[PDB]
Design a protein around this ligand. Structure first.
Ligand SMILES: [Mg+2]
Ligand SMILES: [Mg+2]
Ligand SMILES: [Mg+2]
Ligand SMILES: [Mg+2]
Ligand SMILES: [Mg+2]
Lengths: 13, 206, 205, 204, 13, 206, 204, 13
């Protein structure tokens, strides 16, 4: 999902 | 002629601030296309496959426009890829660092268009089991920005047909089909799309 | 728009002295997570195994904060990882220099947090005897700062579960479990704790 | 000697560097090959490895000087980074070429440059049948990667590859090696596209 | 095949 | 003590000419210690063996001292190895360039002492015939400066025992003994001692 | 430090870099080899791998100094990037040479430089028969890649290769090892070309 | 000897 994608990840934590 | 190209480059590169990449406000479309040269090696012990291709990348920057009557009618020029911003297009499932087979040089056109075509050898994850049969094997690798969502970099292709007009005629592997398809992913969280180009090759021993 | 981003980067990098790394009085916590992509090969003659993974590294610097209002509502930006300090997170039991598979670009957010995700191929010490069995083999490698004690760089994970949602489905090897656990080592001669994250992967053919 | 320091100062510090050829000031690059060794054939990947010297010659007005103003110096050696070099590339390599010689060029007072990189090249070639009397034929094209013939013309002095240095104890003996200028056009554009075709016939 | 040629393609699309 | 560390590094590095290495007049002692992690590979067809180890290097320079009270009570700091001089310690019988496995960062302490601990993989000359016996084989490689005699760089070890407490417990090879010993050669012409540290590892298959 | 820092700044920061030798300021390079190990033979490709120290020596006026003006310093060590070094190349290598030693040289107050890179070289050599009493003989030439003998002359101090630190448990025993200066011409041009020919006879 | 040693060799000549 999101936090596996190197481009969603800045939005996760 | 040379004098004009020197002014032109000096006015675009030394007397400007470097483009900081695209933003959500000023997004960028990158056009991708593949010219597949050879399937060189298939490794059935590790499930890696090695391709050689030309990756055509095209984008346009306002900061790179010039009026060709101010610069001796120059309409385009060649320059080192270090002198300009380049998109961070990456294979999402390589297993070795990509090897570059071509000079790292681009062609810039007076409307801001940049054409950049690196030749590369890529090892990526692919199970070659059954490549020696008549059905073949299918393998796929996705290409995209490593850090930019689709709000900043949109990917497109001009055609879904991979260019095979230069595929090596005496390769160990015959190509059955080769497509390149824009894919958009949404996540249950965020408005921003995620774009990749999915390179799908079906091949078999010749 | 682009002008603002150029302004911001100029303010943060050019006009600003180099950040010298953490210190005992200004310590730094790095968050680590692994996305396991593939066990690429095992070598039974040398007890080396090769992994391919994304290593998420996230940390936060006061000297990288800005007020979005002063910069055209910009809340984050991408930048080359050379433009910034990055932590020296190292595998403690590699047998070859790590191979970087991805662009060296990081994302910086207006609160000072940096997200950086290098994709890497790692050869490390692991005895694969018995992978071709149903119980399989267990392997482990510690990641941590090479030079900074826990008084300068602390570490943590958001989850103890490694992300396997991108694991190559036709890999030669299937994963039975994969954890990432924070450990405190006192391990050398110093009286100061070094922090690591222990990545433990159980796998089989 | 103090003269050479002066000459490199005047040519390299007191000017902006050459930005490459233009349709209006095009440039001719002369290519020649000296084949030293077929090192390796790989019949399971259809790659062959060559070791050769690639002589490149071209001429810039920017690099001219009158020798009588520089202690009668007629030529000098300089690092290839101090000057522009053509982007000549093998069009069917399968590995980045490994450079085997120092990246140093020779410049002559008429602005002639002579650059001779020794290279190990891995390229696409089917070696099946190399162990027969007839051998195998393989071919790799060289040319500019980004310039058309309007900006860079390619030339050879001879169609004969120099085999006078071929390694006499190689696992492969050379039957023939030629280097031929080729021009292709296309429906769309008036611009020629030039390459030099290295055709090598060899057996065990 | 001008659109295959890495020296021609800047003039295609 | 972050503005203080910037101050400290600025005073030590930017505000001074570079240290030119030790001299016959101002000699330098380098302390070497080894932590052996793994004998990862023996090659019987070429008589090469591959080790993975930590090489602890310690020396002291007067130009790197500072008063902690003048710098926020900073007593040590980490810095890129390129910012400082480092000794040219070399294996004398390597067969490949050493591979560096750790970041090139050192720790400098306010007395001027430097600690630098590179993790390396080394291929060196060693005949492994007999490794699969109960007696095992013995291999040895000398370490020293490449260009400095003992008049300029002296070597010592804090102990003659190699640190085995991180040795990979599932290595294909078991260590029977591992010593690191300082050696002094002299020659007839020449008054200088020539110093090396002799690493001697006895090992067999597990 | 104080004196040495002064000297280095006087020799390296005050001056333009030496531009390499010229016909009017020519240069002699002395070469010798210390053979450490024949590491690997490959009979599929006729490549042999050697490990050796290559001693290079030469003398530059621009590096002289009076030891009395510099605290009686008679020599110093310095990074090879600080000075000019000759482009001595093996002429039949098949891979880029691997450097095994720190790139540091020793300079003496009369202008003499001593530079001793350790290298692993892969070069063309047919190892057939190495498992016999008589062994095989191999040879590789070393010289400047870009300078003729009008600018760089080569010499050796002895015809014999130094074998006193050849690895005693190598797979291969050395029967003879020589290093000899040769002069050759090419049909086209007047310049003499100088190389040092390293000839090694060896067996299992 | 001393001319076999990269640390001593500057002296032999
Ligand atoms: Mg976004
Ligand atoms: Mg501490
Ligand atoms: Mg054109
Ligand atoms: Mg001395
Ligand atoms: Mg000449």
């Amino acid at each position: 999902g999101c936090c596996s994608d190197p481009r969603c990840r800045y939005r996760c934590r | 002629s040379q004098a004009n190209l020197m002014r032109l480059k000096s006015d675009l590169f030394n007397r400007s601030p470097m483009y900081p990449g695209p933003t959500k406000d000023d997004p960028l479309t990158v056009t991708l296309g593949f010219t597949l040269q050879d399937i060189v090696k298939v490794d059935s012990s590790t499930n890696e496959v090695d391709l050689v291709y030309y990756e055509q990348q095209r984008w346009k920057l306002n900061s790179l426009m010039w009026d060709p009557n101010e610069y001796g009618n120059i309409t385009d020029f060649r320059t080192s890829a270090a002198d300009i911003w380049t998109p961070d297009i990456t294979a999402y499932s390589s297993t070795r660092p990509v090897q570059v087979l071509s000079p790292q040089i681009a062609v810039v056109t007076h409307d801001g268009s940049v054409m950049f075509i690196p030749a590369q050898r890529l090892s990526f994850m692919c199970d070659p089991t059954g490549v020696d049969s008549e059905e073949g094997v299918t393998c796929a690798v996705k290409f995209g920005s490593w850090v930019y969502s689709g709000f900043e970099i949109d990917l497109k292709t001009d055609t879904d047909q991979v260019d095979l007009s230069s595929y090596y005629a005496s390769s160990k592997y015959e190509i059955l089909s080769a497509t390149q398809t824009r894919q958009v992913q949404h996540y249950s969280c965020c408005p921003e799309p995620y774009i990749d180009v999915n390179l799908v090759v079906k091949f078999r021993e010749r």
